[model samples]
Structure formats: structure tokens, C-alpha cells
Target: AERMLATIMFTDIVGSTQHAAALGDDRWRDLLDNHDTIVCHEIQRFGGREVNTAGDGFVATFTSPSAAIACADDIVDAVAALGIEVRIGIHAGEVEVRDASHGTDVAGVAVHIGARVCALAGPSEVLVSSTVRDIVAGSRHRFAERGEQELKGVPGRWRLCVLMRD
Candidate 1:
């Protein structure tokens, strides 16, 4: 697969362990079912092509930074309203584009950054890396400086920013 500059997005449930313990198996299942629906549909709306899902998490690829930012915010809102919070992270870089049994895999540093950023984000927050921040540097999105974070598996320190748009 050739290199394609893709915006990678990764998301996971926040406080998932507590939710499962508090809600039990049956209720947690129902919550997860709804979350899956919200993520799949929202990615389409933001111009992201679904790459794959990692267990209870999700991974997708967008053409550019703005789409990634907008889409992540969309998921945040939907999940927030559901009373089930989640964290999302986005990064733009080269990802391998090839068809596979899983449709296509977006493999590269972009995916790694996305995963690390998601891990750094708090519940109900959408975090973007400096790479994405540069792309939307002039936009009117509400950005809060979260300082630099150490992204696991991704080399070097990354500037963390959050998009908290209403």
C-alpha cells in the first residue's frame, strides 16, 4: 500500500470498568450496542472511512484534519447525551491503504498517535495532536490547551489540545 496522508481517529469508552461493574452484564451490553451505532454512523457523517474496531474501541480514517476534529466532537456529544462518556484522539499522517478481510487497514504512526491521544483524553473530551492542531489553527473551534503529553508507542512529546464545542 502506498502512503496516503490520512487523519487517524481512535476512541474508547471512559470509565468502562466502572460502568460494567455498576450496570452488570446485561445493561452494559445494551450500552455498548448503542455506542457502536453512534460511532459507526457518526464517522460516516464526518467524512471518515471506517478502518476497524479494536474490541470495545473504534478506529477510523478521515481525509483531513477538520473532518477528524468535527467527527470526534460529534461522537463526544452523542455519547455524552447517552450518559456514557468516551474519549477520542486524532492525528494526521501517512497510513497504509489496502483492501483486506477487514475491508482496509490504516497502519502507520497516525494510528499510533490516535491510540495514544485517545488514552490521554478524559471522559467527554476529544483530544487532538499538534499535527491536527496545526491544520485547524485558524478555525473557530474552542480549543483548550492541555499541554504536552507522553504518547505511548509514539516517539517524542506531543502537544495536547481539546475541542469542546457546543
Candidate 2:
């Protein structure tokens, strides 16, 4: 496995299961399709590499920390017309990359950290780890501290920041 510094991002549709039940299966699938399309478009536009997706969530990587944050914000705004909200989390750390038949698999603590941050975010919110905020410093991106919290199954208190929506 190749270990490299990467900006990992995780996103999930807010209240997806509840929405699914209320919208019916067909409608929920359509909604998910729309959400996935928006996510893919924003990810590509911001130069992010699509890693994989799970149900109503996405996992992607970007070489530029600023681009990842911008992409996350863009995704949230773009889906507003569909009346959907999303939660995003980003972290910058070393990732383990292993080649697969499809291409590559991103693993390691960074991915876990990103997911944990996502779990902490509320509806329509973009959260980031201190590493990501510090890495993107002076890149025209701004954030407000959301305070430190213990990440589930992870050691240390992580200082989180909310990437203010545009």
C-alpha cells in the first residue's frame, strides 16, 4: 500500500432514510439519482477524484484541500433546488492506497477521520478537521470553529470548523 497525503471527503444526504420512507421507493430512488449526479458533477468540476459511494453518501479525494472544501459547499448549494440537504466532512491526512481491479481503494485513519467528521455535521453543514483548515489557510477559504469533540473509535479531541456557506 502506498501512503500519501490526501484530502479525503465524505458526504451524506441529510435524513435520507426518513425521506425515503416518506417519498416511496421510486421517488426516493429518483432523489438519490439526482443527488448522485450533482455530487459527481461538483466533484469533477473541482478536480476531485471519485473514490466510491455508499447508498446516499459519497467518498472522494482531492489533491487540493481548498478545492475539496469548495466542492463540498458547491454540492450543498447545487442540491438545494431539489429540496435536499447534505452534510459534508473533510480531513487532510495520510491515506493508504491499494490498487484494485476497478482502480484504487482509499483506506487508513484519514478516511475514518473524515467519516467521523461527517457524522458530527448537522443538516446543510460542512465540517472539517483542523488539519484541513490549516492546510487550506490563505487559500481564500474561511471557517469558524465548531469546537473539539471526541471522534468515535478514534483517539484525541479533534477541533472542528464549519466552512461557512457562500
Candidate 3:
């Protein structure tokens, strides 16, 4: 296994379980397919590599933290047109990389932190860790402090910020 420092983004549809129940199987499947397409497109558009996708959520990596934030912002708007919302989380750190049969896989504290951060986000919101904010300090992006938060299964408190959508 190899380790690398990368920015990770985690995204998931808000209220997916309840929404699926309301829409029934066929309708929900179609909506999910469209959501997946939009997510994949935004990922590629921002030069991100799709790491994994489970149901209505996605895990992707980007060399540039700014690009990851940009992708998340775009996805939030694009998916809103589908009458759904998504919550995204981003963090920059080291990840353990492994070769998978189909492609590549990553795991580590950074990945865990990313998922936890996503869970803290509100519907249609993009939440990023302070690490990411610092890394992109000089970029055109702007952020509002969300205060310190405890990321489940991760040590200590994390200062989180919301990526303000212009």
C-alpha cells in the first residue's frame, strides 16, 4: 500500500431514505440515476477522480482543494433542479492507497474525517475542514466559520467552515 496527501470530498443526498420511500422503486431508481450522472460529470469537470460511490453518495479525490470545493458547489446547484438536495464535506490529509480489481481505493484518517464532515452538513450545504480552508486561503473561494465540531471516530475537535456559494 502507498500513502499520499490528497483532498477528499464526500457527498450524499439529503433525506434519501425517506425520499426513496415516497417515490417508490421505479421513480426513485430514475432519480438516482440522474443524480449519479450529475455527480460524475461535476467530478470530472473539476478534475477529480471518483473513488467510490454507494447508493446516493460519492467519494472523490482532487489534487486541488479549490477544485473540490468548486465541484461541490456546482453539484449542490445542479442537483437542486432535480428537486433534491445534497450535503458535501471536504478535508485535506494523507490517505492510504490500494489497488483494486476495478481501479483504485483509498482509506485512512483523512477519508474518515471527510465522511464525518459531510454528515455534519445541512441540506444543500458544503462543509470543509479548517485544513482545507487554510490550503485554499488565497483562492477566490470564501468560507464562513461553522465553529469547532467533533468528527465522530476522529480525535479532538475540528474547526469547520461552510463554503459560501456566491
Provide the TM-score for each candidate, comma-separated: 0.91, 0.95, 0.96
Cα lDDT, model 2, residue 124: 89
Clashes of each: 0, 0, 0
- Put the candidates in lDDT order, highest first: 3, 2, 1
Give the per-residue lDDT of model 3 (tens digit) for 1-166: 7888899999999999999999999999999999999999999999998886666799999989889999999999999999999999999998997747655789898888999999999999999999999989999999999898976757788999998898
lDDT score at residue 93, model 3, on the 0-100 scale: 96
Clashing pairs in model 3? none
Per-residue CA lDDT of candidate 2, range 2-86, in tens? 8888998899999998999999999999988998988999998999987856668898899989889889988889987789899
Q: lDDT score, residue 6, model 1? A: 85
Best-to-worst TM-score order: 3, 2, 1
Q: Residue 149 of candidate 1: its Cα lDDT?
A: 79
**Candidate 1: C-alpha lDDT:** 0.83
Give the per-residue lDDT digits (tens) of candidate 1, residues 32-87: 99999988989988888888679777988887788788888888888887788988
- For candidate 1, the TM-score is 0.91
